[PDB]
Amino acid sequence: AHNQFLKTFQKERHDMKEAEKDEILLMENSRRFVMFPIKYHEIWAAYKKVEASFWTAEEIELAKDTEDFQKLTDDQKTYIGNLLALSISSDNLVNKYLIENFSAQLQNPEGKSFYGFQIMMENIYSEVYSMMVDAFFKDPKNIPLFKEIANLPEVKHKAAFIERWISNDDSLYAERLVAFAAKEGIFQAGNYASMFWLTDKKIMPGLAMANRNICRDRGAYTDFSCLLFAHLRTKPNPKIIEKIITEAVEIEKEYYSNSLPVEKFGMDLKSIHTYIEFVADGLLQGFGNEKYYNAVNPFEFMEFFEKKVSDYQK
Amino acid sequence: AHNQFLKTFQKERHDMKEAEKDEILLMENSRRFVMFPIKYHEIWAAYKKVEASFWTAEEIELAKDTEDFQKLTDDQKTYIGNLLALSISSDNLVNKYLIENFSAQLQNPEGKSFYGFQIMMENIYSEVYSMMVDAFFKDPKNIPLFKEIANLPEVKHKAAFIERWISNDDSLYAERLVAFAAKEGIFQAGNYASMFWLTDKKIMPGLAMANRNICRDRGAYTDFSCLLFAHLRTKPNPKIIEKIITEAVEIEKEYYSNSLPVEKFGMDLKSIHTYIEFVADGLLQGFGNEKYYNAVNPFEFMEFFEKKVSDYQK
Ligand SMILES: [Hg+2]
Ligand SMILES: [Hg+2]
Ligand SMILES: [Hg+2]
Ligand SMILES: [Hg+2]
């Protein structure tokens, strides 16, 4: 099964565990909390970075945002409700647990300093969701999908991905790190694409903000998993790097063809299908891996000086 | 020794452990992270409260604040340096570890949500200190006391207090909770009193802010240890409640008669000695315990509508 693939590398992934001991990033030493005089500049750079963007639930004003809602189709309506629930009970949850695991794995303070920020926010995002559910659904009862999540091809197929690549005894840091990057960046690439499209221009402001933010932050987060990935000596055969993102890509889509609409919501599915591919490649690259899908951005998207600066460094 | 005192209660502190099982606040259940629909309103009230006051190191501009420094006595000068070090290596450290312990002990999410905020800040305060040390001391080398801290009557006498009341197998939640409140509220009541007095009016702004904040926050923090204390069924014999704050009061003082000046700094020690007493009583009361020292505020201090509201509720 999943092993048959990993069996194909029982010689370059053996040398890896055997080398993990010498992976100083995991060289569990004293530094539990950030003694100052910092050595890891980047890892810290990133902490301060996301730290700058801090925000609260109060930053989300829900009313005059309830309007545009009750004045819509009957599904975009339920689409949202499923969206706002596939989170508050699915992702947001496993989300917080995972961050502690990885945080624990990371032996450098400055690092667990970033993670320490992240969880705090995942807690704060949770409230934004329980803010929109009350906002335009009055009660936890009023949501359909909110009861048989555990029994959704997609959520089920998702969990297997984590238990398969992360929470698994037979795993390697670099690997779990990749997937985790996959889980944060790829999984839910639609949700954003969706709400983006929607809110875009003259629809439900608060929601547009929440999504603008959340999506942002989660972008930094994923970055961290890379910023960490780039520190490891013995990297995962590019092959393995692929399957991971590959697997995530496919699992991601399923949600829009099964659980949540995108068809009934109001868009040309084949596009979301492609965008997901987009994200993944850019992510494939960010781990020292050649593009796969070779997709092309289907929607005018936003997540200059620097980019054009380095573009002329290459 | 310390036990002879606790031996005097080997019948009302036996019934306590025996009752801890039934202390629902420690009734370790599933809720690891805040499922929304919140039950503990206060505990959450407090989270959101401190959450409102969030801040960063960037909020502390050090320059034009370096001036007033180099234009002072030779000790206030070193007094500060010892101050800024007795933290960055003594309190700030044990500070972060303790918060995880207690956080772990607290079985309710909303609760470990607050603690989750606190540590994050203790990390951010650490930088404010390593901001002032570079600000007006150029190097870790340039600080005297910064080498034999482990060998200071006070720090040593302090640690014993924690190992004696908190990190100790033979302890009771309510008790550790008290001390922890003592450790946050009482220990360092001087430092603030000091820097307050100093900065007060026309001296080193940044520092005045940092202290204004830090002191604030830590005030909320202590409150939490009470807000938690008030939830427990079986309370600690008022007697025990006392020794704790009593012990802390005395340990606190020692610092200003031994390590750091207050005499050479520029004040009438007998005052700080009394203020410490002040804080403690107000804290003694906040645990359902009659005033002890019966001190009276010696300095015009700040940490209305509500106060005068409840004053006419009693
Ligand atoms: Hg995103
Ligand atoms: Hg990277
Ligand atoms: Hg204070
Ligand atoms: Hg209280």
UniProtKB/Swiss-Prot annotation, chains A, B:
Domain of life: Eukaryota
Primary enzyme class: oxidoreductase
Temperature note: Optimum temperature is 30 degrees Celsius.
Catalysed reaction equations from the record: a 2'-deoxyribonucleoside 5'-diphosphate + [thioredoxin]-disulfide + H2O = a ribonucleoside 5'-diphosphate + [thioredoxin]-dithiol
Localization in the cell: Nucleus
A Pfam family of this chain: Ribonuc_red_sm
Biological process per Gene Ontology, one example term: deoxyribonucleotide biosynthetic process
Key words, A-Z: Acetylation, Deoxyribonucleotide synthesis, Isopeptide bond, Nucleus, Oxidoreductase, Phosphoprotein, Ubl conjugation
Residues at the catalytic site: Y129
Residue positions, PTM Phosphoserine: S167
PROSITE patterns: RIBORED_SMALL
Example of a GO MF term: ribonucleoside-diphosphate reductase activity, thioredoxin disulfide as acceptor
GO cellular component terms, A-Z: cytoplasm; nucleus; ribonucleoside-diphosphate reductase complex
Induction: Induced by DNA-damage.
EC number: 1.17.4.1
SUPFAM superfamilies assigned to the protein according to its UniProt record, in alphabetical order: Ferritin-like
Extra facts: Present with 88884 molecules/cell in log phase SD medium. Lacks 3 iron-binding residues conserved in all other R2 subunits.
Subunit note: Heterotetramer of two large (R1) and two small (R2) subunits. S.cerevisiae has two different R1 subunits (RNR1 and RNR3) and two different R2 subunits (RNR2 and RNR4). The functional form of the small subunits is a RNR2-RNR4 heterodimer, where RNR2 provides the iron-radical center and RNR4 is required for proper folding of RNR2 and assembly with the large subunits. Under normal growth conditions, the active form of the large subunits is a homodimer of the constitutively expressed RNR1.
Family: Belongs to the ribonucleoside diphosphate reductase small chain family.
Function: Provides the precursors necessary for DNA synthesis. Catalyzes the biosynthesis of deoxyribonucleotides from the corresponding ribonucleotides. RNR4 is required for proper folding of RNR2 and assembly with the large subunits.
Protein's name in the database: Ribonucleoside-diphosphate reductase small chain 2
Lineage: Eukaryota, Fungi, Dikarya, Ascomycota, Saccharomycotina
